Symmetry: D2
Subunit: 87 residues, 4 copies
């Protein structure tokens, strides 16, 4: 359905307590808003909103619409970002 993706949810540098949701092996180090959006589009998810504030440290959020629930979508996104990085 529709949900928010917060980059920390996919960040392998973080504990679950600090925001990571995906298993650390699936997660990637310091995922960027730009990478998440790129993956979402490759995965044919609809991008509803992308907000980014850079102060440079980046703070951001993405709202997505997907054929699947958030958990599954986050994994597909993390895997896609890993692909991007392996090339």
């Amino acid at each position: 359905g529709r949900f928010v993706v917060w980059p920390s949810e996919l960040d392998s540098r973080l504990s679950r307590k600090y925001g990571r949701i995906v298993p650390r092996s699936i997660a990637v180090e310091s995922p960027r808003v730009e990478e998440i959006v790129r993956a979402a589009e490759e995965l044919k998810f609809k991008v509803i909103r992308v907000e980014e504030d850079k102060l440079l440290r980046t703070f951001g959020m993405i709202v997505l619409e997907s054929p699947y629930g958030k958990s599954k979508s986050l994994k597909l996104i993390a895997q896609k970002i890993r692909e991007f990085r392996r090339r």
Copy 2:
């Protein structure tokens, strides 16, 4: 622990497909960012980030919170506090 809260997650005007997470009876109608921040503060959750963009005003936003509880339980507690504020 730490997690994001997107207002649509506790919006009773939305189906689960369109973003709602909490049970529709606990959900509240059109929760505002300010309402969520106020509830979090009353619940002694730590507010880490609050972003809001308002256009023409239609609002878009997110809150990052630190809670002793997981997101599901925290969203429910927040919804209840918002209901309480509104009732006054």
Copy 3:
């Protein structure tokens, strides 16, 4: 005209080099986005967009407004309105 207001433009805590536009005596300490919005509404300026980001540590943002005056005059009027708001609040109760 339509123009952006950046809160630092009227912040007396800041030097001109760091972004303050209005004279220091008219500027106010740490103007909040919400106060600028309230001032604009009392001044009958139309608010087109309000963006704010608050980070735990604090506040960043911008307001797009329409005003019958140029930006420089409008900033001064907003600063003076906020000064009035804060004073009215202080004397209350």
Copy 4:
């Protein structure tokens, strides 16, 4: 000095009433936040803050940049606009 750049200030698609500061021929069509940042960096300005919000009505964009420049804002906006025009000509392969 430090100041804000609001992309509409240099957007040739807009009238002055809707926010455009610089002359229309210097302004460029729909300058993107990222283009302004790229221009500022090329011009040796220092970028302090960049905010952008993109909403699906591809996406409608809203944003602002805080910059530091040796020049006043009016001249900096013109320099930025003309630099973006140059980048775009390069991307188009038209000099």
